[PDB]
Paper text:
Mutations in leucine-rich repeat kinase 2 (LRRK2) are one of the most common drivers of the familial form of Parkinson’s disease (PD) (1–3) and are also associated with increased risk for the sporadic form of PD. Its N-terminal half is composed of armadillo (ARM), ankyrin (ANK), and leucine-rich (LRR) repeat domains, while its C-terminal half contains two catalytic domains, a guanosine triphosphatase (GTPase) (Ras of complex or ROC) and a Ser/Thr kinase, as well as two architectural domains, a C-terminal of ROC (COR) between the GTPase and the kinase and a WD40 domain at the end. We present cryo-EM structures of LRRK2RCKW, WT, and carrying the PD-linked mutations G2019S and I2020T, bound to the LRRK2-specific type I inhibitor MLi-2 or the broad-spectrum type II inhibitor GZD-824.
We observed an inactive conformation with DYG “out”, αC “out”, a broken R-spine, and a disordered activation loop in the presence of GZD-824. The binding of GZD-824 to the ATP-binding pocket was shifted away from the hinge region relative to MLi-2; its pyrazolopyridine group partially overlapped with the location of the pyrimidine and indazole groups of MLi-2, with the rest of the molecule extending toward and past the αC helix. As expected from a larger inhibitor, the binding pocket for GZD-824 was enlarged by the DYG-out movement and opening of the allosteric back pocket, involving all the main components of the kinase’s active site. While the G-loop was in an extended conformation in LRRK2RCKW(G2019S):MLi-2, it was sharply bent in LRRK2RCKW(G2019S):GZD-824, with F1890 interacting with the pyrazolopyridine group in GZD-824. Here, however, the cryo-EM map for LRRK2RCKW(G2019S):GZD-824 could accommodate two rotamers for H1998, while WT showed density for a single rotamer. G2019S can accommodate two rotamers for H1998 (B), and the model in (I) shows H1998 in its “down” rotamer, which places it away from the inhibitor’s binding site. This prediction is consistent with a study showing that GZD-824 inhibits LRRK2(WT) in an in vitro phosphorylation assay with an IC50 ~4-fold lower than that for LRRK2(G2019S). The G-loop adopted slightly different conformations in our LRRK2RCKW(WT):GZD-824 and LRRK2RCKW(G2019S):GZD-824 structures and this could, in principle, have an effect on H1998, which is close to the G-loop in its “up” rotamer.
Numbering used by the authors:
A (entry chain A): 1335 to 1354, 1370 to 1378, 1388 to 1395, 1399 to 1402, 1413 to 1437, 1441 to 1469, 1480 to 1488, 1498 to 1509, ...
B (entry chain B): 43 to 126, 128 to 155
Amino acid sequence: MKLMIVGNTGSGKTTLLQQLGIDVKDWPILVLNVWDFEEFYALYLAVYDLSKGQAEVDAMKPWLFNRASSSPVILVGTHLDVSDEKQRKACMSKIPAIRDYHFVAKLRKTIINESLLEKIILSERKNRKRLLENQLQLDENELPHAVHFLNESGVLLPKWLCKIMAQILTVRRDVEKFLSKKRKFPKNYMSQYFKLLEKFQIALPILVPSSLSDHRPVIELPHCENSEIIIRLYEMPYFPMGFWSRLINRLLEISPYRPNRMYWRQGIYLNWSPEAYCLVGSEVLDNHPESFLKITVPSCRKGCILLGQVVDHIDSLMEEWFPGLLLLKKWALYSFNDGEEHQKILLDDLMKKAEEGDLLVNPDQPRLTIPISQIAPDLILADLPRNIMLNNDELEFEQAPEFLLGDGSFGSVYRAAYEGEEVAVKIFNSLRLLRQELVVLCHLHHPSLISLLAAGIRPRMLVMELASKGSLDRLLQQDKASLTRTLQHRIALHVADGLRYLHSAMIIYRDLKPHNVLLFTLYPNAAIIAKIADYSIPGFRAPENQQADVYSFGLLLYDILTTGGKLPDPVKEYGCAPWPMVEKLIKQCLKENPQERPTSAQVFDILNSAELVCLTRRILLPKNVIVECMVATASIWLGCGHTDRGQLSFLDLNTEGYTSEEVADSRILCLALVHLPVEKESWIVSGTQSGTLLVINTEDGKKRHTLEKMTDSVTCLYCNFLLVGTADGKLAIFEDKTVKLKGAAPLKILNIGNVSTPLMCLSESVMWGGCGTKIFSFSNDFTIQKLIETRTSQLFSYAAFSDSNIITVVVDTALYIAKQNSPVVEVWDKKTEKLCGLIDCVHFLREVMMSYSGRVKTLCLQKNTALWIGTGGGHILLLDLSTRRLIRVIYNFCNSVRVMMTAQLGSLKNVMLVLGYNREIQSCLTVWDINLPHEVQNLEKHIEVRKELAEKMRRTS
Amino acid sequence: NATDEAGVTPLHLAADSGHLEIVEVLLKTGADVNAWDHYGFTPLHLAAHVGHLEIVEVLLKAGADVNAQDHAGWTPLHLAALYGLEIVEVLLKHGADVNAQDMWGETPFDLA
Ligand SMILES: Cc1ccc(C(=O)Nc2ccc(CN3CCN(C)CC3)c(C(F)(F)F)c2)cc1C#Cc1cnc2[nH]ncc2c1
């Protein structure tokens, strides 16, 4: 237990301590750490001087008002030898909770009586906290429990306290050099200087609340008559100590739509232009030994708004810091005629009257009355924005449990109509709750925040947009069929864009859950789908702040990826479709360490990417497996060349059941599929380094054979006829019916080049292909139609790239050809046999964010004029063929790209399969939605339109 | 000397084409022997890639460094061994590092 000594100034606390900032000492008895008491304010010892009698006893109540958990307090009067008996009797008459009284070794015995691996740490450490030598069990993991233990015991933090901290009371520009920059104050602690003062009520983001005096300066008001000034006096028995520092702190963010700011220890005077000002000084009334915090405001519109803001701040301080006063009594002054003495009423009256009407009828002069808004313009919300007061002639409202909205799950909210349109009405059965909620709502204008349409007075209601489609919770539970992937991403994006807005406004939004997500439409391309709400009426929260919000949003994103359901993997647990880059984001937000969770801006930035939406799968093959080619059947066949003998791999795109088998004595470089509907069969042909074309039945692996061997390495295969391109510049044409025959000879052998010029690519639009530096075309008779020599491309580009091997060719209207170890893709006109275009991958990669190579490794094409280009690094350039513009640069998934091609899944969904390398070496398969460029453009337009709308609502308010 | 739209100097082009006379005259007049384009290729990089031995020799005599790394991290030894090894021998006679690694961790004798 801790013994702490407090009392009035000069009461003799240290004198008692000898007879038994805030300096701390050790006192054994039950060994107690004793503090000698200001800033930021066990067993309590209340010390007062008896020489002033009850005059010293009074004003002690703040000591009971101020962080105790109902701990005992001991009251002692000192200097009894110099006090009078009548003063002591007054002290008796006067007398959180006091246990016993004394008036001076009785004090020490009273203290002893009232004071009457197990955390064995902070002994060597007191005289980075892990292992100072691991104490206890892993040093309690440095959990907040240990921090609270060390702070409460007063052993670690108070080294600088009362010696360096809190010395500015008598001692941030021109401030640090005298307070915390004397001898040894490293620049590592600039962020803590003049910031730890803020938490301790010592400095304010304006200032030490001690240079102020208790002498009120001269105050002059532009208005003087009773009928033109609203005066509010909250009276509190005591002004619970520490009140004025916090009040001076908060009364800065006050706006009528701070030219002059005077202040002292008890009082501030804020002055804008005339008919806009507020005096919040503290007045002393004769024969009233209480504190009178008085507010004097002009009666105009800006006066009403300013008084409302000041009162809101004061009751906010009451609710947040000094709950004990909520006793404090509020009054308002009035005068029926000018010159009459100001008369006062408690606020419950004029509240009943604002409910009943808008006039204060004089009891004796029935014809003489005052409107309420002229007396206290907060009971009638005369502070509402001009477009927010309810027009009772435009509201069709039925208050019955038949049009109840959400069946009351949203609180007391009913369906209604406002200005014709269908609308929602929340009926407030206190005025404090309504005013607080209005203050919060009037400063929140963003697309994902529920918009406020009206705020009534006589009903005392709120009226807001009717989400026609219910909340997100009902979407998740009832109509699961309409929850498409695009809609899920839009909902999550919309919630994050607005959680980050609340965090920008320094608003916590403690509990975020699906119930607080309101849906206006289910059409994915809409501008507004989901907003966030708080009806003010649990498994969706952090283990315990913005990190709690990020954890809540991670749970919400988990419950969006999953339709509905430490925390298990969503795909394995619920069988939902995989969604990479959202599973990772869920894992990131759900980190148990608050400092490792991403901030809401980072979360939204992660969600704002089309790589996140159209990345269907990302499969990592076993480590040290190197595969060079694939063919899609869904299922994928891969050619493993990680050793001197090629192997055949099979990957099931639904189960991820990778398997492999040694099939050839040489490395496999090319694969293809021969389909024979006429027999209803299919073969897989493997072209290896030795030149062996080895054929497998996909239905049963035992049926295997081999065609006629070529004279050199087989470089490419295509499939009706089978075309085989070898490394010695030869093309072998087989009939597909001959593939099933062991040792079958090709239908034709055609020589394109020589041994040093290998034929490497074959594609359809008339057959087209590439060998060495030449492009060749064929008719249906398998004869040469044209040869285009591409070494003239050396007249452009550079000879290092142009004079190389052709690795892939695609053609719809132009020849898009890529070379070996070249970042330049050349575009040839197949009708004129002349080079007409260049595409530089380095040029594209430089415009977008040392870890890049840019050498083209593969190409692929879509019917929607789209060209996919894989670079040597882990980059895919998506381009529009209309103008060869850059649609997107996919990157930051792996380190290298090997080959990609289009495919169709078993669900008839078109995807793009990209095989690359994580260069120790781990080959990777990536699955993209075939419509990725369109999603990129659509989401860019969606973000642009939504940002434009957000700016519009921010400007218009 | 000036760079083109791809950052390529006349010395880069001469190294690509293998012109002994142009490389020699540019080095004699004071061309930047270690200038690089957006690809990170130095004169010696291009000479090793294309396969010109005498260009490599005249560049090394003019002060070309054998430890330059391009955008892909490939030293002139990498481009010399990748395309075949007289140029490898000439570069190794100079103080070249055979343990240099590119972005994928490959030494230039692994490319051969
Ligand atoms: C009828 C009604 C009244 C009020 C609100 C409201 O939310 N107000 C409100 C207040 C404060 C804040 C900000 N925070 C909150 C967390 N605080 C901790 C920090 C500050 C927010 C927000 F969070 F939004 F910013 C919203 C919504 C509705 C509604 C509705 C409705 C409409 N349409 C529907 N259809 N089916 C059902 C249904 C229901």
